[PDB]
Amino acid sequence: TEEQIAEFKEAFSLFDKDGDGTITTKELGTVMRSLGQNPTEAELQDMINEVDADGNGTIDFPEFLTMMARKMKDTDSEEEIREAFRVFDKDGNGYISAAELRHVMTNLGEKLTDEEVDEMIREADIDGDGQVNYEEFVQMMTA
Amino acid sequence: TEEQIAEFKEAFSLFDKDGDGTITTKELGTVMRSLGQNPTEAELQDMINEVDADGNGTIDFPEFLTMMARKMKDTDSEEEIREAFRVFDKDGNGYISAAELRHVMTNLGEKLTDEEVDEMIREADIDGDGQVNYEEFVQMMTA
Amino acid sequence: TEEQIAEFKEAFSLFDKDGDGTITTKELGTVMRSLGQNPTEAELQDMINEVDADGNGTIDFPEFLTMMARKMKDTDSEEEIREAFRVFDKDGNGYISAAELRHVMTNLGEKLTDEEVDEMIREADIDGDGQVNYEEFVQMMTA
Amino acid sequence: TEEQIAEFKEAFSLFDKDGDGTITTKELGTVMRSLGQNPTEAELQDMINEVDADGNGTIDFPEFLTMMARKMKDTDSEEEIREAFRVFDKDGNGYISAAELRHVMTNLGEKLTDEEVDEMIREADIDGDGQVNYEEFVQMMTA
Amino acid sequence: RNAFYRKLQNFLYNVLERPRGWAFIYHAYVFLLVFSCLVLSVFSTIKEYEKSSEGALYILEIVTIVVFGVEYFVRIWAAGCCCRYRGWRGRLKFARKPFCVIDIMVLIASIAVLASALRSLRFLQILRMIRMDRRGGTWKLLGSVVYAHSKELVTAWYIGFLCLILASFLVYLAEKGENDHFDTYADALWWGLITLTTIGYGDKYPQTWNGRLLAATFTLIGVSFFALPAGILGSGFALKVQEQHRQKHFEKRRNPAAGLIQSAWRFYATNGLKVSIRAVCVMRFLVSKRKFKESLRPYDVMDVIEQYSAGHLDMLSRIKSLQSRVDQIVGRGPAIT
Amino acid sequence: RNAFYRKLQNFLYNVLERPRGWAFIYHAYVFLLVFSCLVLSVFSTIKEYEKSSEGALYILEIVTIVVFGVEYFVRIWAAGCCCRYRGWRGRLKFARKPFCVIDIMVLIASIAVLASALRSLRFLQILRMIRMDRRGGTWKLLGSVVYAHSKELVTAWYIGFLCLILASFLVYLAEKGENDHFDTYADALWWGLITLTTIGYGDKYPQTWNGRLLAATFTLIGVSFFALPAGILGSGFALKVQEQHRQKHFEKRRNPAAGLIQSAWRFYATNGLKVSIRAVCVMRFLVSKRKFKESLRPYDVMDVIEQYSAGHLDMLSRIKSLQSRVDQIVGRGPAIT
Amino acid sequence: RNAFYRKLQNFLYNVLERPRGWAFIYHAYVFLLVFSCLVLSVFSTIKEYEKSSEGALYILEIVTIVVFGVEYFVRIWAAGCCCRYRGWRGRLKFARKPFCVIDIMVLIASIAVLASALRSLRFLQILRMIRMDRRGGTWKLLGSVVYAHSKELVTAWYIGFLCLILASFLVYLAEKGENDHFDTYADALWWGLITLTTIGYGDKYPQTWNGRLLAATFTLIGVSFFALPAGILGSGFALKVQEQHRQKHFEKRRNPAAGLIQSAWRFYATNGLKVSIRAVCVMRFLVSKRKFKESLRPYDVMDVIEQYSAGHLDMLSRIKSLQSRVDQIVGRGPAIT
Amino acid sequence: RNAFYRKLQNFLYNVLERPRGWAFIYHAYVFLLVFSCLVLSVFSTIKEYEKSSEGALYILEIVTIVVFGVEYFVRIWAAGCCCRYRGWRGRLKFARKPFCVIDIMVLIASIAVLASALRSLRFLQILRMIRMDRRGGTWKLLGSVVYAHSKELVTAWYIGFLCLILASFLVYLAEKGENDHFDTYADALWWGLITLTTIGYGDKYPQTWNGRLLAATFTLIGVSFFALPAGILGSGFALKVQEQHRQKHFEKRRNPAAGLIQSAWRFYATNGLKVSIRAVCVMRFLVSKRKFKESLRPYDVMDVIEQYSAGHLDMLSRIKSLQSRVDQIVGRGPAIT
Ligand SMILES: O=C(Nc1ccc2c3c(cccc13)CC2)c1ccc(F)cc1
Ligand SMILES: O=C(Nc1ccc2c3c(cccc13)CC2)c1ccc(F)cc1
Ligand SMILES: O=C(Nc1ccc2c3c(cccc13)CC2)c1ccc(F)cc1
């Protein structure tokens, strides 16, 4: 809403240091440096085209707002998370050991700190059985 | 209806110059020359068999009327347009850039003039995002 | 019903010439000779096992009655006729020319006389378009 | 319920001879010897992991109770029995001869005594036709 | 008698023409006999063994020629059975076919030699050997496979040809004078051809060490390229025969489809002479249904995919119907509430 | 003791008969021993090495013959274990089998030579070598592959045969007098065979330049055709072994299906001796279900296609049920409104 | 006239450039002519046949050079037709392309020799032979296949190389003095190379019996490994050509998709000049729809799998819709009751 | 500086250890250098070229030995970077590995010869050549393929072995006295081996016409069988490399799955520092989702079949849900009416 729109304007101003209303790749790099993460030029460009709808090389404010207006249910990513968890579920039991979750989050992709995996276990492992099914995880994440 | 039937009779009379009630391949060629397009014998024969139900080598007026009585929803072409747009959608995003539309209509098949692609963008690109989904195009075209 | 059961008893008595209550392969051969058709031993044996539920080498009267009690919708042959007509429909148009019907019935399998193909055209080609769809044929046959 | 829980406590006490609340592989072997069947170490270990949810190498009492709390419909084995019976149904007729049932139970897997196959025929072969369909068997087994 | 005569004529025709079983056995025996004639002729060409070889060959070629003549007469007699050719004029009109011409001229040549002749005998034996196909099946398969793999075969031909020429010229340069084998470029080309094909007669081989090094560097790649087409043709043959088997399977599907549809129509329309007729008709129906469903053996992933996709499209139609019904219920909801 | 004796007898039977693991190791060792005997015999046939070769061969063939005799006795003793043959008469009735006859006559021949003999020794060694299969597996596979690819193999045979004959005759004509190698047609055929097979001995090779040109033009295609069947047979062998693996996989599927169905019936019907019995029964049920579902490994696209098409037909039945229910609701609509 | 001139120019361009049909026939004829020139040159290199060979070669190379010159002029004239190059400067800018450079320098070399020359003639003929491709298609295919199978080819190279070296050294040790063939290690390596490649010249072969045994033990595995890459390359060629065919099929799919979408839009938007226009437009629509659906031939299991999985995802969307509607009905139930 | 030093150490380690790109170029250059050393040694073994060959070989082997020493030192220095081995003791503990032992003993042997030596030089060069793999990849692939096709390879071995022995013995019988080549059985076996392998040296070949006929009849089948394993191994190599590619594809799938799940959890849990954090997090989410879905490339029919069958099972669950809802509506019908 209008309050959310103003919050997004503040976020964009923090992003678009140039102030031209577009977040250039350099501005994104500087802000991410502020976050301490290390981006590359190619990955950043991929980022822009993923979030850019005009393909102008920058992120104009309405595109940014629309991205912030895109909710997870609108993402239409249920199938992708289904497939990811299936990939991790070798046996096809429908679940996966919490030890397997800790191992895979801590040794693959963007490694997650212990706090993150603990909270994931809390929210997803509602049954507290150590074997978190993908159905429950994705439905809770989307709903 | 009866008015439509009379309109079709007028169209057929404009077509069947021989007046025998059948549009011979030569009559179709002459009328198309009137339209300025260049047909070949084989393509014209294919045309007849596509629109001919008796396979007599000509189009009797009842067959012509039935063709004019065949509406797009009755065509049962939804799957074919689905597949065509899928072919054009390399990434599988569910959409395709309006620039891609202009390029492909202007450099493939029966090339369309700028007016045609503009009106296609108007009707299909209802959201005006440049990325026209195939779902909306086919549903509007059929409905 | 009881009247149908008595009719089946009469049919079986006409079949089981031995009168033992079972139609031996020889009895089937003799009756078919009465019909004028030429059966072979292997095809007749296949016939028995197709209609025989006990596998005793003969057709006891209750098995015969059950066969006569088996109606087309109980046959569960819709898929098979679907596949047969699909095989005959090279182009996949959903129909097939009445000329194709005449040709194929008259030059394949158990060839049918002209009367049979004519009545098939009458019942199946309800639209009288020469192109009989398989949907209508199978639904009329089963219903 | 509480009565069932007490019955399960009695069963576990008969199992966990050590009395530590966990049925070690040795205890399972001894009880099975009491039953007269011959287990191997590897098969017993597989057994534990199949029924063990903690993977501690033993079966704690709540895991055992949950196993006893797992009913056939909760097993979700309908598809597996479907596939097994399909494997046994060479012709794909939807049934299988009672003689085939006797043969296969008596000459494959954990061979069943005559009494077992007879009672299976009684319960599954409700129609008493010798050809037991898999649909009826699995639905009766689950329901 | 006359019906028996016609049945004979036709069975004999099929045996001589496209055969199935023991007719292949007869064809194998006649092939073996002509092959024995050929090998005996080869032995006759030797000087020492001339006497016995010719003695046996005389009787063997007598048997061969009489067999070929009787088979020609029988083939002509058989062609009158097929509806395409009947009576007197029909058999001659059949004999107008070119293969009849080659066979008959072989026969007359064999008779003429019967009643420098060694060269003519060799030619006629080779022509007979060619005649043993009678359908061009082998040649048709070979040509079809070559056409199918024209691109790979042409690649191998061009590359191996260039390799042969280049290696031959380079070695010739490296062994122009030192080795008497390569005194001319033609000798070098002969060497290159007999090596790259791995035949390696040994009459010509490089001796200058630099020539030997060039020969090695080029023979590796050359032999690889010259061996390529053998494997390419093997794969092509396998693929083409598999394709013919698939087509045969689909025709064997086509026929029982007709059988099933005919029998199903009869069973539908036939609804105690009448009861007996309906009983036999429905009996035929189940038999034909079983035969057809057995004939519906996938035989291939694509085949089962097609058969299942037909049902999937049917599913799409059914789910469209259910969408229509649920839309009707939704529209009724407010209407009735 | 007696039970241990029977278990031994049967384990030994299986080792001698269809073996799995280290029984293959024993078979490899006996094959190696007979192979060493053969090579030592080959050396004995040489004149210089006769003394030491024969000295070692005497003891080695003594070991071979005693091993073969003890293995024959053990095999006969083992055949009594299988239910097909037990006691005294059963073992002899087993020995009536032809392979028993070949093995035993090899044994008696070896003993007879033990107690011009070189030719008999070579024959008996070759027969022993043949005996090492004991199942015809290699021969069965080869024959099956040849039959499967009969059409391509026959194409290669016919075409290569015609090419050989034609090329040989043409070269013979082109080199009748100039080259002493081809004084007769038989020599030309020998040359053609040893070239088109790429053996190229070098005893006979064309020398007239026109003869050389014909030899090139024909040897290209000839060597290609003569190499074809090697690749064809390789592909056939691979395909056939893959098919056997598929069949083995399906049998390994068949057995756990029986296990699962039996255990599921027991678990269903078994509903603190009684509680313990039900616990063990259901435990077996989950174990057998896991074993079977693991055994349901696709192993092939067609396999998974079949398993999924079964479920798709189930889906069709379910959607028919839902169509029936929606039709019922539609019919109720007007009825209640 | 001018339009006819342009149509000619372009048809001639396409014939000279990427050809389809009888243009291949013309290219085959020019290739045959240059090949005849090459073989006549080979004969000229012989001493006896020098006179007639050179006499015919003079006129044949005159014809070859004039044909090549006219073809170069025609190609340059044709390049002006394509929009990339028009007028005067465009044709030269096209000729800047390297293949134009090789062709033209071949032409000038041929003219210079026209107006020790045997070596230059051989070089120019080889260069012409290379020129006959004009697209690098064969080289591109070969390189692509080699890169694709780099791992297996490198395995074969390394293993066969080690086998050759080891066998050669071992035999050299076993035949250092006894056989004069292997007096040096280089001779042993030459022997190993000519055997493992199965060429077997016969100039060098082992004679010491222990050397013969080592030669056997190593030649088995060596010849197997040296033959490997031929079959590997054959399979690679087949796979790559199949892939190109698949890509061509997909492009032939891409074009009719555009045709169908354009015609469908026209038919939708066109809703007795006006009636005639709509009639022709819808007529085009059905024609284009038929053309496209015909173009949707699976050609491959994966292709049909993709086309069906698209519909399956559509099915998933539809079943989600039906789940939504049934949930709405369930929620209404209590609300209205 | 120190961080730069560690980054260097590790990049150098990876280059020396499993390399990707230009590290392959360096490895190719070192292989080329050692190969040049080997060929120069071969030339040195010749008598005429000894002077210049040895002169160049001295400096080339100096370069080779210094390069190998520096590479060994660098490898040891690099092993300290990997966590398995760090500091002083870790590098030695790594060097305990057997491949380190072979490399180092090669180095010390090369130094010892540096500071009858021809035989030792040849041995050390062969050992270096073997060392160039460093991973057993080629040997692992070859052994895996042989094990996979053990049955077909054993069939070929047994059948070809029997054919060789039988043909050799038969020819020996047919040429015991007439041809001096076959005076002993060992000579016959040598002939059989060099023919059936198509090497055909030409030192021994049959001359008696009956012997020639037997040689033909057996060489046909023998050469076919001896050529079989080449094609079998080619197919096996192709299949195994395809399997490794499939496994690599599946691992490349496994990693982005972790990435997507992690990023999706972060995006879910992160719901103007806070707004900026959520923006970057969701941005990462879309990027990772795109990367993963791209990583979900079928690459194989079975792969897409699995991915679609998962959705089909989901469909089965959904249709079960709809069956439950329709059953509820049906039960309500009478209840409310
Ligand atoms: O590929 C065939 N024959 C060549 C094999 C190998 C090579 C060649 C070359 C030029 C012309 C030919 C062939 C260069 C290298 C071949 C043709 C026809 C046929 F029926 C069976 C086989
Ligand atoms: O194809 C086999 N052997 C020929 C290879 C090549 C050719 C032939 C010909 C005639 C007869 C035979 C063969 C002409 C060209 C072959 C047979 C049996 C077997 F077990 C393994 C291999
Ligand atoms: O594999 C090819 N040529 C070798 C075949 C066999 C072997 C080799 C070795 C080293 C180097 C090469 C080859 C050892 C054994 C080959 C290369 C290029 C090409 F275009 C066509 C074929």
Ligand SMILES: O=C(Nc1ccc2c3c(cccc13)CC2)c1ccc(F)cc1
């Ligand atoms: O198959 C291999 N080598 C034989 C090829 C052909 C034949 C043989 C026989 C006995 C032993 C061997 C082979 C009889 C006919 C072969 C082994 C190992 C390897 F790494 C690469 C190739």
